[PDB]
Amino acid sequence: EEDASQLIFPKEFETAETLLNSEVHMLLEHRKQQNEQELSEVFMKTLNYTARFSRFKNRETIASVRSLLLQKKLHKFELACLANLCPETAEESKALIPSLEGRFEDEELQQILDDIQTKRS
Amino acid sequence: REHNFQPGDNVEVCEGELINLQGKILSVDGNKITIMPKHEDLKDMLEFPAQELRKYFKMGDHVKVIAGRFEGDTGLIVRVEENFVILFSDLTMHELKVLPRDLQLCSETASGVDVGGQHEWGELVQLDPQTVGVIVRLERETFQVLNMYGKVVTVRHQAVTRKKDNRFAVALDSEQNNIHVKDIVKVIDGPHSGREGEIRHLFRSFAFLHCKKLVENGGMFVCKTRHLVLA
């Protein structure tokens, strides 16, 4: 019954806040910087994964795409996966996230995707 | 003829004007069920006997097979055709192809919880007068007995007898200090490199370690004494 395709999630987990792969890369690198008992192999396999997929690396550049998206009608679930995937076209964003089908028109949605790609190093 | 529609599974209607409507099983019988099916997202009650219903499962939730070659086994379904519902077993990353009518839905683990209480978790045994071991998992024809070498040899249920505990035993460790049974240690070096446990039994060259987070061998592994540190 719990399906991310249509946004149905647990009662205690709807109040949770999402994070980007770079955003957790900064938090986990900061915790490794403090601690180096040792870190677990679950911590190690989340560093190397979230490193390979950290698509843009300044934090401050997130807050514009966050503030405009809550000025649109998207959820905080899309706010992080559309910054982890880094999709090209609005037709790809609706194909990856089925919750975007009918939620916006393509040419308005495409403008946000072009705004995200600019931050990449 | 027989029907295997147990409490807590899911069925659809396979032919007729009310086709493809999935509901949970509440009432159980043989042929004449006259079911009241509890659907997802549908408030109304239908009425069906056993011959007009199908054991149906959406991709990616847990299944248990009752009858077949692979009987008594759990996994995840990956493709659902009309009669082949293929799945991954939780024992092995291997194919498993079975009929949907002999299948059932439960999200639980196959634990093997006790009745009566005559043997228990981490209990010492004597397979042969030259070797020692611990009994950790009851399988359908076989047992996971873990010997002192650190290995499972694959034996039937009748191969084993009950050994009395050496409760007053000690050995020597990485600091050349006293390590006993019923004590929490860390096994960083040795065959089982990077493991956490409590010792339950000792021998000539070995210690029988115990945990609940570990899934292999009922949570147990066996290692040398000079590869231990006190935790």
Partner: protein, 915 residues
Amino acid sequence: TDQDNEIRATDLPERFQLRSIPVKGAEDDELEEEADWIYRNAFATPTISLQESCDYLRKGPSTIQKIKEALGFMRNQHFEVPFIAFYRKEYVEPELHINDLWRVWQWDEKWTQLRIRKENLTRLFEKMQAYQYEQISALADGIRALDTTDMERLKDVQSMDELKDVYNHFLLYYGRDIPKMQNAAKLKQASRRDMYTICQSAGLDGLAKKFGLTPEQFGENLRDSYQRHETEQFPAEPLELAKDYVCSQFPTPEAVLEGARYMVALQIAREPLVRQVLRQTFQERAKLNITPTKKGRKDVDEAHYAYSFKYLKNKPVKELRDDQFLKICLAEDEGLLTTDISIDLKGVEGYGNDQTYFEEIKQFYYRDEFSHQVQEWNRQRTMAIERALQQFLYVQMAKELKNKLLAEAKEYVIKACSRKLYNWLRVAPYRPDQGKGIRVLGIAFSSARDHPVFCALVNGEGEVTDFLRLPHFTKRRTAWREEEREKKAQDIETLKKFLLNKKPHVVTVAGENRDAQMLIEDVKRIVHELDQGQQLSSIGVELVDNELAILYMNSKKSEAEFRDYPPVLRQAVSLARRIQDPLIEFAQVCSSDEDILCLKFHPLQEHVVKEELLNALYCEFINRVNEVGVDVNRAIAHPYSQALIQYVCGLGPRKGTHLLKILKQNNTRLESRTQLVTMCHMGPKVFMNCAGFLKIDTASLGDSTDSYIEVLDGSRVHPETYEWARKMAVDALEYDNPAGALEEILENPERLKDLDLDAFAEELERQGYGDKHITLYDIRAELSCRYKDLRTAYRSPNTEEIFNMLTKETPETFYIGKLIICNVTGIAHAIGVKTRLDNGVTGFIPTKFLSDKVVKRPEERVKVGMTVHCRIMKIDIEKFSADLTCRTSDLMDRNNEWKLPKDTYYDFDAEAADH
């Protein structure tokens, strides 16, 4: 399964049918290209690392023809390696011995694999070339046309590395259009963009092309080490030119150049010629650097396998020896070390920076003009090459080279396993100092001194004829209890009566531990008491390694064969059988469940590729089983020898089982080799492969079987050559009956020594059979002694073999300088302290080495039963004793006089800085 019936029916060797990629016939053009390709890659190309010449049995350019012959026999005529190595050796010697023929056979799989991908990749390049031609015939600055040079690169590919370069290059320029091509041919594009596709969507191609050299021209300047191509110069500064490409994705001239530099940097890194030249250079220049982690500085102690190399600085990969790189990857996988491969020397020097590879190659893209316009373009070219080397090529070349160094180190460990198995299977049957075999008494015991000794008497056929238990034979004649002496005297008389009654030719004692010396000293004395009484001929008393016998005793087979017998008595039977024929015994413990891997071939054998190691070990069985030859009637009469039939050339486990199955169903011996065709319905190619290697004991046959017995069937003459063997025997007697001639020559073999075989080789060559010189010298040698066992004659184990066998140690695991744990057993008069190690060596600490300070009485320092840490100074292999020290100055080794020798490139400066 259905496959097993198809394999039984099909007239091809079973291992040809079980090969991963099916064997297909080859045209002479394919065989000539393959023969040259196998010669370059398998025989001419030296290893990157220092590897011992593992050819335990560079081969010159004449080897190319010998490889062309060998591949013709395998691919077109379907002969396995042993048939070629024993019955076509005139076409493959002197360059190729049986292991080189296996190396050719293994590399033919790699050639076929390469040719298959290179063909399918050509089908992709042809479809892409056609798709571009359609779009062009229906041009924008981003259109690079796939031309005949792009195709000629692919047809010229010589390895899976060069193929991967040509494919990655193709994906960079055309990967974006692949889904469009496939949809036009009649599925949705996998989408992700590395920054290159963003730069192409922004149209930076018009700017990336303006840096001067195209990627290939820079590749040619790299290849040739001078500017073969002069840098084409655009007439504007790059920072002014960048203004034309500013958009929402690249808002500034500085960002447009950062995007275009990336796009050029990736084009340099994915140019096949640049990768080829850099890979070639990286294999020459690569330096390996190693640093220990925070875990590694604590865990890599003096005893750990990673000790000699935990800090390496600037070690050339050309100087890694044998398995060393596998030990490095294991220590890195354990998280103990971090490894770094750089083309540069690492160091803080100004000359150190000037000497870097990047300072050499920047010169191949700079335009040598001092004008500020050119100074700023040379700065952009500098940053494009810096990004191309550091972010793509140095990372990708280090990963490719790491995989090669690791593959060479794993292949050394595999070759070291096979070289050890060869040394076990090559031992001949024991012959007392013969036609009815030897009766052997194998004697086994457990390391626990209260467990009973068991003896098993095996007849020459391999059957257990009688067995004995001796509950007190482990006791010592100098025991403090006289009851122990008395109870052992009854067992000594029991063994003495058993030897007197059963008269075995050799008694084998298990190499379990040092008490095997006590059993051998007693058994040799008991045999000498029979000799002093002159009652019996000399009986051998041999120490036999019990590792194989332990694997037997623990096997499913040893219970299925003898369910009723105790396990120590099952290790007594394998110790009798091993000295009768080591090969037949080693074939018992090597099941379809892959039980073979439980033997200690090499300390790292569990870290090499399992499937490759199993091929490398089963090839040692196939080499020796076909040299020794298999008696099928011994297999039918004695189920013990049935294991060899699967290792006969051509046969394998399915056809081997089927051959015994038909002969069991008919209830007949195999009387003559023709019956493999006429009773067993064996096809001509499988018969060709196995017929020379199957023995038939023609002397064992009689009665109605006398109607058809070819005397050659007991020998290595192949049935295709029986006519020449008969002619050679008839002519050796100058007869004016070929069977009578052959019997007369086999009884009188000295008569053959006058016969000039070379004239007959000329006549067979003239008759169109080709060169037969080596075959005729072999047929003459074969009639001189049919089936002479070519194995090395049995010898008792030497002092080094006995020590390793009884302590379970090697010179690497028990070395001078090692730290050890021991129990004190006593004091010598004080001259020193006696100890016993866990491995059973009796250690001695001379009184002056008990502490740094003068100790007059050892009782002030040690007690009997006390456990003590000590350091080995000297080893006596004959006496099983070692001169130990426990002085604190030696225990911590404050002078570093005992610690294992470190690598030449060990970084003592990092070691001192971390301390």
